[PDB]
Design a protein around this ligand. Structure first.
Ligand SMILES: O=P(O)(O)O[C@H]1[C@H](OP(=O)(O)O)[C@@H](OP(=O)(O)O)[C@H](OP(=O)(O)O)[C@@H](OP(=O)(O)O)[C@H]1OP(=O)(O)O
Ligand SMILES: [Mg+2]
Lengths: 357, 159, 108, 366, 378
RNA sequence: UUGCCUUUUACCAGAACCAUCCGGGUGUUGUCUCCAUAGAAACAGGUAAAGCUGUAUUUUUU
RNA sequence: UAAGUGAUCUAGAAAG
């Protein structure tokens, strides 16, 4: 997250950012609500290079920089137990199938058939979809009788907004189905004022569904590539232990040389100065790499929506406290939370059914 | 880098140094806490030192020094020991040391809270429930000397 | 300086400017694990502790019926039912048979 | 340089005077404890608000397998894979490896000194036998003082690297060349010891001439260039005789020279063995401070002295790995280099200083 | 020294300790802060002791007695104000000193030397600290009294014991006291020079020290000492001439320089023998097993070698040995025989020793001689 | 700009500027040295040695 | 699921 060191030199940065975007294709450059600009690098070194280019040769401005955050993504673990509607629309949700996730990351009848090939899903759910990014299923009972359910293009766009800015901390939604269950469209209404209602209302519905779906936050994971001399193998393992959530999957021995080009997986959060640290520890015998093309997201350990949750302010938060910390902290970053003390929670009536009764 | 051999000795030395001063210091307490936290061996050392104190060394001290010691132990007790307490007969200065300790605890934790905490623990010598023929009278009596409750309750229970 | 933590530089200070890590740092590194029993006790102390459900049930029920309808659609569209009447008729049948069964359910 | 520019000293290496005089705890998530090592690795990214920061290298993994002895072309350190009448090229060359190619390969992998089989000469001075030790990392668990020495050395090195002093080219009339041009100099092949002794004699005569010229005959130069007054001095006389930082500096340089030349004389005069000489010279260079108050007059020589000390600390503990303690190490090269460079630095300064001095002796002061 | 960038935001637990006032050969000097009762302790303590006092006052009333300081002993030094303030020599005068704190405060505005302890008054509150503890602990911590004096020129004075010490002029004394430490052999760059007429190698100039030493050896005192010792030795030889078969005990008259000249040495006494002597191989005085090789001498020599040691060069035996086989085996200032004897006296430590060749049955005489001279040379 | 300090030299070590100096490269001239020291050989071939090419049955030529 | 690797400034002469 960039901010120019002086607000006097802000326009320059914007121009600079534009230039960077033009020149560096693999950079999502979201201008966040505060003014604090987000830059999404591919990884570390690339990001650094980008910044160097910006800070030296285009901006020529001193720049405040956040420590390397990671684009998280909200999701669910189970199907949404409730179906609470939205008003001045009740959208249920559930976890997309893990094969189907992968299938998605890369003619209705045809699509239906494909769906039944992927996860053996029902033809009812197959017909009513309109997915993006995850899946918008138009699966109430009245929707086939009704043509209020028709003209769901606006509705789909609203859904797109939901996907973009999730309930938790404006973190994009990932791996989640969306079963519609009702709509609160009265008889006489203009399509402008009704559609306009439904757009934010759609977002609200989605958020509600997520809340009721036991929402979980998903961090990404770098696929790792570490060539090291065989003698320095257990060191790498130790380092991984030192890192959080890091898995080591196959130590394929590269023939005809001491290199054990070991694949791995470090969570994108835990990964920072990984290359460098490895190099240091390995005495420069461990030319390591990180990358993210699989789009292999995963649940941050620990459960969102906890009061006490964690211990530390300075120290890295525990495993079971982590998700909550990430959420609240990211909300603060994104300026959603009010001051220091706050909480991510449901904006609905009935006292949340007295907190699940 | 002191080995497991003298850790106990080190702790003893520390205690003695504490005693030498005019009053109990936060300093020593913090030091004790840190060391305790560090390694299980030091926890053991501190424990065994405590045992040594209430066993044999305790009765040699003067009411000022003794009081200080009690305070120190109380501070430690409030956090980094379990309230294990090997405690009618032995009331020369040990019992008054105990008084000081209890005072410290109450001041730190709180009365009801303290009671709750001890309730959770065993507390054989402090709070016997099995009557033992006018023996609870003694403990009860001693705790009436300081502001403590539940002694009355205990006696009621016992008849 | 070193890790955001050394002295700016040894000139000025009027000393070595040697920078030990404390060994109380291990205590500050693991006080939650060391004093887990402090929170554990507390946690233990408070460790014992319809409309939506109904809605869900309803959805499941209507949804089931709609699955029947879908199935009808499948059978028709695949195996010899090019006409619309076949589809509509099938739907009607589903409604009648399904809502009959579900009327039975209601009765029970 | 990066470490310098951010005050993010890499603990094995140097630490400098600082180059200069949102982000809240509530916001960020300290998952990786962000180390200084990273703050120089990707300087523009991990270290926010960089200034004057260079970009370092980034690199490939080296598997240069070196052979021990008595063999060639063998997989040792590593594991093996899973699975019309004409001869081929270079036929009748049965032996694949020559007797030198075992070594040639090694040579090929070597660094800049031996890498190559031709070069231009450099001055003994210009060769840095010691730079390669402290530029590469300190071996294993030396005493704190030696570690400090290493750091000091690196600090010097980085400074030298950092302020490039581009030599000006137009002035291609050297001093010696200029002198050669005239008639009043002749040239001879003289033994270095002879040169030394003659130069002590010359220097002594010079300084005495200067002192007597000034008038203050009561300052007796000893032949060992250790100046002292003969009589108790009248205040006026005393005032007169406070010779400045030029003359004294000159004396000190001659003292330095007189020492090493004298040691050579001793060696060659049958007194001491060559090892003893080498040690002697080394002692002199590492204890110039302690043998001639050069620092007194020109205190920036402390840097030179410090450098020498550092070298000694470095050298000895590479010289005394398995060998025990004691004084008998020689190896005077890098210290000698230091002193040469100090002289290089000062030759201008003394040309100015003593220039003005003798001008005053001759022409009145302005 | 915790993480400066984080520490600004929130209080950290102290993580990294910087080295404050460091030193080479780090003897852990205790602070002062440990020997002052921290305020909270002082105040809780005060509350206790004053409560106790109150209770005992009531007891006194009930009993109808004067509550004497014999009963309140222990608490005498505790509390605020200090209990001592109850029984000091004039409370009934100080009873009428109301508005005392304010007056002490406003001494600030009406005086040049504004008192450093404005904030309390000893009459009203008593000694709110006591740093004899600090003194004692500090001396215990620098290796004790015993060890500090090795730094000092105590050994030079030659008292029976240091315990028998008790019963720009003032700082001169101070400088002279730490002469050995301050003028040290092991030293960074200090260039060696010697003071005039002496063997007091100053490792880099110190003015005050120089002034001291020069005053110490005024009237060529070093030279006089040297010559005196030589004379004494000559006398001794004369006395025991016929015992050790000596033809003539002649003094080789050297320049006055010799006394304190250190690069070279002419022999002070030359010893013409009657018969050939068969002197032992060179050795120290206390080295008992003197090896009598077949080598003989018709003539010995005695040299004195005065020295003034430091806290670093405070062994003499080694030095004297060095001197002996330096000047012998050096082609400047040759002795008539390369076989001879050399005495050296550490004037800074009264540590006599001598090295060299030994005529049979001579050593005991020399040992005894040195013992005598050291006990009382004029 | 800091530090030691406190009065300056001398300095601490950073900055920006600049200069000096120890050296270096080539290229061209000239000198100095040590060795030298020929005003004509091919063609016709031969001898020997060095540089390229050569060893029909459908698209080159049978 | 329970310890201790590591960062180490100076530094002396003149004249006052
Ligand atoms: O560190 P320095 O102050 O420069 O002194 C060193 C150091 O002596 P200290 O450690 O006592 O200070 C060396 O000792 P080691 O660290 O190597 O044990 C010693 O080197 P040697 O052991 O090789 O003798 C050397 O002495 P020398 O100069 O005789 O080599 C000596 O230097 P100084 O003698 O100048 O103090
Ligand atoms: Mg003035």
């Amino acid at each position: 997250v960039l901010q120019p060191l002086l607000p006097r030199e802000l326009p320059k940065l914007l121009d600079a950012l534009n230039k960077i975007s033009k020149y560096y294709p693999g950079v999502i450059i979201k201008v966040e609500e505060s003014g604090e600009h987000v830059i999404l690098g591919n990884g570390e070194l690339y990001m650094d290079c980008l910044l160097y280019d910006l800070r030296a040769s285009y901006a020529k401005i001193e720049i405040k920089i956040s420590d390397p955050l990671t684009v998280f993504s909200e999701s669910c673990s189970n199907e949404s137990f409730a179906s609470i509607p939205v008003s001045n629309i009740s959208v249920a949700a559930e976890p997309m199938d893990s094969k189907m996730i992968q299938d998605l990351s890369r003619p209705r009848k045809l699509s239906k058939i494909l769906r039944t090939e992927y996860g053996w899903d029902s033809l009812a759910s197959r017909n009513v979809w309109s997915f993006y990014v995850l899946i918008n299923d138009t699966l109430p009972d009245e929707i086939s009788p009704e043509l209020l359910s028709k003209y769901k293009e606006q509705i789909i766009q609203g859904f797109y907004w939901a996907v973009k800015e999730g309930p938790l901390a404006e973190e994009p939604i990932y791996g989640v189905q969306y079963k519609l269950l009702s709509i609160s469209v009265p008889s006489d209404v203009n399509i402008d004022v009704m559609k306009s209602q439904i757009i934010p209302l759609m977002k609200k519905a989605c958020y509600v569904g997520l809340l009721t779906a036991i929402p979980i936050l998903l961090e990404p994971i770098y696929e790792v590539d570490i060539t090291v001399h065989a003698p320095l193998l257990p060191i790498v393992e130790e380092l991984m232990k030192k890192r959080r959530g890091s898995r080591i999957y196959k130590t394929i021995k590269v023939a005809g040389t001491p290199l054990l080009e070991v694949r791995g997986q470090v969570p994108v959060i835990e990964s920072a100065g990984f290359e460098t640290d490895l190099r240091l520890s390995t005495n420069g015998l461990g030319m390591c790499q990180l990358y993210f093309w699989h789009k292999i997201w995963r649940k941050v350990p620990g459960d969102v929506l906890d009061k006490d949750a964690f211990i530390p302010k300075l120290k890295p938060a525990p495993i079971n406290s982590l998700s909550r910390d990430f959420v609240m902290k990211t909300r603060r970053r994104k300026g959603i939370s009010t001051g220091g003390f706050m909480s991510n929670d449901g904006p609905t009536l009935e006292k949340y059914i007295s907190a699940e009764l | 880098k002191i080995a497991n051999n003298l850790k106990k000795s080190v702790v003893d030395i520390i205690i003695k140094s504490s005693l030498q001063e005019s009053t109990f210091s936060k300093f020593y307490s913090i030091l004790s806490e840190r060391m305790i936290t560090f390694h299980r061996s030091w926890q053991t050392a501190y424990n065994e030192t405590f045992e040594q104190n209430y066993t044999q060394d305790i009765e040699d001290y003067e009411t000022d020094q003794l009081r200080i010691l009690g305070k120190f132990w109380g501070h430690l007790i409030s956090y980094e020991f379990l309230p294990m307490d090997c405690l009618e007969e032995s009331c020369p200065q040990g019992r008054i040391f105990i008084k000081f300790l209890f005072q410290e605890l109450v001041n730190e934790l709180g009365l009801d809270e303290l009671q709750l905490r001890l309730n959770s623990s065993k507390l054989d010598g402090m709070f016997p429930l099995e009557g033992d023929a006018e023996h609870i009278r003694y403990s009860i009596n001693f705790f009436t000397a300081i502001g403590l409750g539940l002694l009355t309750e205990d006696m009621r229970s016992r008849l | 300086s070193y890790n955001g933590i050394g002295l700016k530089s040894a000139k000025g200070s009027s000393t070595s400017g040697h920078v030990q890590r404390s060994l109380a740092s291990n205590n500050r590194r693991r006080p939650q694990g060391s004093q887990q029993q402090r929170q554990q006790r507390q946690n233990a102390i408070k460790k014992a502790s319809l409309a939506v459900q109904k809605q869900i049930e309803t959805h499941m029920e209507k949804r089931e019926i709609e699955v029947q309808v879908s199935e009808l659609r499948d059978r028709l569209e695949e195996e010899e039912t090019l006409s619309e009447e076949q589809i509509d008729k099938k739907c009607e049948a589903l409604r009648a048979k399904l809502t009959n069964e579900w009327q039975e359910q209601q009765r029970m | 340089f990066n470490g310098k520019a951010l005050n993010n000293a890499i603990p094995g290496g140097p630490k400098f005077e600082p180059l200069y005089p949102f982000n809240s705890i509530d916001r960020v998530i300290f998952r990786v404890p962000i180390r200084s090592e990273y703050k120089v690795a990707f300087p523009h990214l991990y270290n926010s608000r960089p200034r004057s920061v260079r970009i370092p290298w980034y690199n490939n993994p080296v598997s240069c397998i070196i052979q021990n002895d008595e063999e060639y072309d063998t997989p040792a350190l590593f594991f093996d894979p899973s699975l019309e009448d004409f001869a081929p090229l270079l036929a009748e060359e049965e032996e694949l490896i020559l007797p030198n190619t075992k070594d040639a390969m090694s040579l090929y992998h070597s660094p800049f000194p031996f890498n190559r089989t031709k070069g231009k000469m450099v001055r003994a001075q210009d060769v840095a036998l010691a730079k390669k030790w402290f530029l590469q990392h300190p071996d294993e668990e030396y005493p704190v003082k030696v570690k400090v020495s290493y750091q000091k050395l690196l600090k010097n090195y980085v400074l030298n690297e950092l302020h490039p002093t581009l030599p000006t080219n137009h002035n291609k009339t050297k001093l010696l060349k200029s002198l050669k041009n005239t008639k009043y100099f002749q040239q001879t092949t003289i033994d270095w010891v002879e040169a030394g002794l003659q130069l002590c004699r010359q220097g002594h005569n010079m300084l005495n001439l200067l002192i007597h010229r000034k008038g203050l005959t009561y300052l007796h130069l000893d032949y060992n260039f250790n100046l002292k007054p003969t009589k108790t001095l009248t205040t006026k006389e005393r005032k007169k005789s406070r010779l400045g930082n030029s003359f004294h500096l000159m004396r000190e340089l001659l003292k330095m020279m007189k020492l090493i030349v004298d040691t050579h004389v001793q060696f060659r005069l049958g007194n001491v063995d060559a090892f003893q000489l080498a040690d002697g010279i080394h002692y002199i260079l590492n204890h110039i401070g302690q043998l001639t108050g050069i620092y007194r007059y020109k205190y920036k020589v402390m840097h030179q002295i410090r450098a020498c000390k550092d070298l000694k600390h470095i050298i000895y503990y590479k010289f005394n790995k398995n060998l025990g303690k004691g004084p008998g190490c020689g190896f005077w090269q890098p210290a000698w280099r230091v002193w040469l460079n100090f002289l290089r630095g000062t030759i201008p300064l003394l040309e100015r200083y003593i220039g003005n001095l003798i001008t005053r002796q001759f022409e009145g002061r302005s | 020294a915790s993480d400066l960038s984080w520490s600004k935001q929130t209080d950290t637990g102290i993580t990294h300790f910087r080295a404050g006032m460091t030193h080479e050969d780090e003897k852990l000097i205790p602070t002062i802060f440990r020997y002052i009762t921290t305020w909270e302790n002082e105040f809780l303590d005060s509350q206790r002791v004053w409560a106790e006092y109150a209770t005992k006052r009531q007891e006194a009333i009930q009993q109808n007695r004067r509550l004497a300081f014999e009963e309140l002993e222990g608490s005498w030094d505790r509390g605020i104000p200090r209990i001592s303030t109850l029984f000091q020599r004039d409370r009934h005068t100080l009873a009428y000193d109301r508005g005392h704190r304010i007056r002490r405060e406003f001494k600030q505005y009406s005086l040049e030397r504004n008192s450093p302890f404005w904030w309390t008054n000893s009459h009203h509150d008593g000694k709110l600290w006591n740093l004899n503890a600090y003194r004692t602990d500090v001396i215990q911590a620098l290796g004790g009294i015993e060890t500090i004096l090795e730094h000092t020129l105590f050994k030079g004075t030659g008292f029976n014991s240091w315990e028998g010490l008790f019963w720009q002029i003032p700082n001169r004394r101070f400088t002279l006291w730490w002469s050995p430490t301050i003028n040290r052999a092991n030293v960074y760059v200090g260039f060696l020079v010697q003071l005039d007429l002496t063997g007091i190698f100053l490792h880099g100039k110190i003015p005050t020290l120089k002034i001291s030493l020069i005053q110490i050896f005024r009237a060529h005192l070093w030279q006089k000492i040297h010559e005196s010792i030589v004379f004494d030795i000559c006398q001794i030889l004369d006395g025991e001439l016929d015992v050790l078969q000596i033809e003539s005990v002649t003094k080789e008259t050297v320049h006055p320089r010799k006394s304190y000249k250190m690069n070279s040495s002419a022999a002070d006494i030359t010893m013409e023998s009657v018969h050939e002597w068969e002197v032992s191989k060179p050795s120290l005085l206390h080295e008992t097993n003197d090896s009598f090789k077949g080598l003989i001498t018709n003539k010995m020599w005695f040299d004195v070698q005065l020295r003034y040691g430091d806290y670093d060069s405070h062994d003499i035996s080694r030095y004297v040995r060095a001197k002996f086989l330096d000047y012998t085996t050096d082609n400047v200032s040759m002795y008539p025989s390369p076989t001879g004897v050399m005495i050296g006296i550490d004037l800074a430590y009264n540590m006599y020793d001598a090295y060299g060749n030994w005529f049979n049955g001579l050593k005991p005489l020399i040992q005894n001689s040195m013992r005598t001279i050291m006990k009382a040379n004029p």
